[PDB]
Structures are given as C-alpha cells and as structure tokens.
C-alpha cells in the first residue's frame, strides 16, 4: 500500500522508452524472466484490460524485437535513444532495421 508522490513533468509522452535497467525487479512479459541490473531494456505504453489503463510493459532487447515491434527511427521514437552512448545508439539502430533477432533455428 505505497503512498505515491505525485509531481511529474514529461514534455514527450513517447511510446517506447529504453534505458540501462536500473534493479533486477522489472518483468518481462515476452520470456517471463527477471530482468537482470545494469541490462539494456525497452518498454512499451499499451492499455491493460484488468488495469483499465496504461502500463510501461518492460521487454529485453531481443523479446521486445520478438513480439513484433519494429522502429523506423528509434532516435526520436523511442525515449532515452538520445541518452544513451553513441555505441548503445548504433546498436539499437542496427537492430531496428533488422525487425527482429533472429529465429534462425537449425
Ligand atoms: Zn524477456
């Protein structure tokens, strides 16, 4: 039963927001695992039926790619791109484009 402090200020409601896992807490909704600390994650803003509201849905690197979530232009986008380093940028980048990790089985 936390109490809350309210008091915040967003100019852009993006969408998508990644950025260095902060604690080991946050679920993943795609591999029903503990996301690990210090671990490059995304989150995503969609409408839960029992929350009747909406709800940051962390996803690893590759399960938010797994779902089916592609970006075109995640530097703006998607939230934090412009926080992170220039290598974590190229990355994401290199992976947008590609749409997907790679389920090349066998
Ligand atoms: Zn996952």
Do not use: N
Request: charged share 25%; glycine share 10%.
């Amino acid at each position: 039963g936390s109490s809350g402090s309210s008091g915040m200020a967003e100019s852009s409601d993006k969408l998508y927001r990644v950025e260095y896992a902060k604690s080991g807490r946050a679920s993943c909704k795609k591999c029903s695992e503990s996301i690990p600390k210090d671990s490059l994650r995304m989150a995503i803003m969609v409408q839960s039926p029992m929350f009747d509201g909406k709800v940051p849905h962390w996803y690893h690197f590759s399960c938010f790619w797994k779902v089916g979530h592609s970006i075109r232009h995640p530097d703006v986008e998607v939230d934090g791109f412009s926080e992170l380093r220039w290598d974590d940028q190229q990355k994401v980048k290199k992976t947008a484009e590609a749409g997907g990790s790679g389920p090349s089985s066998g």
